[PDB]
Amino acid sequence: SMNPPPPETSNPNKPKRQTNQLQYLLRVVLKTLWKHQFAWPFQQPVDAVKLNLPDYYKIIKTPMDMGTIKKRLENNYYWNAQECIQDFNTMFTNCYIYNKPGDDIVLMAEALEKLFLQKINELPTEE
Numbered sequence: 001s002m003n004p005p006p007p008e009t010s011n012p013n014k015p016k017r018q019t020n021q022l023q024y025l026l027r028v029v030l031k032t033l034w035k036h037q038f039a040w041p042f043q044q045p046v047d048a049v050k051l052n053l054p055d056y057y058k059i060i061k062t063p064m065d066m067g068t069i070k071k072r073l074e075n076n077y078y079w080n081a082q083e084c085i086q087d088f089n090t091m092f093t094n095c096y097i098y099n100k101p102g103d104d105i106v107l108m109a110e111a112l113e114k115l116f117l118q119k120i121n122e123l124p125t126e127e
């Protein structure tokens with residue numbers, strides 16, 4: 001059993017910005033989801049070896065998790081807020097694609113997604 005390498009979190013030739021929307025994504029959005037009681041499965045890449053999910057990376061070809069997002073935000077990896085919002089949405093969608101409705105992990109993702117949507121609704125205008 002093998003896990004793929006994680007998503008990229010460092011790339012010196014990718015242009016980067018530090019913007020008020022990206023600061024909101026770290027200070028408000030990521031921090032709110034990270035502290036939630038259902039955050040733990042999403043705080044690092046899925047370890048398909050330890051979890052005995054040998055088909056996980058056959059089905060999920062664009063993996064994403066909040067550990068990766070946290071690193072991207074803390075290392076100013078992004079150019080704009082849309083790129084980070086897409087990462088969160090990829091994380092939720094992967095969970096719904098791989099699992100069954102009503103599975104514990106899906107209910108956990110849904111609770112985090114509800115908070116995510118609430119916070120993104122008040123994403124500040126770009127200064």
Ligand SMILES: COc1cc(/C=C2\SC(=O)N=C2N)ccc1O
Nearest residue numbers: 040041042046094095098099105
């Ligand atoms: C079973 O599908 C998923 C599993 C996880 C992670 C888990 S599950 C567990 O017990 N520990 C973990 N770190 C994350 C997203 C998924 O879609």
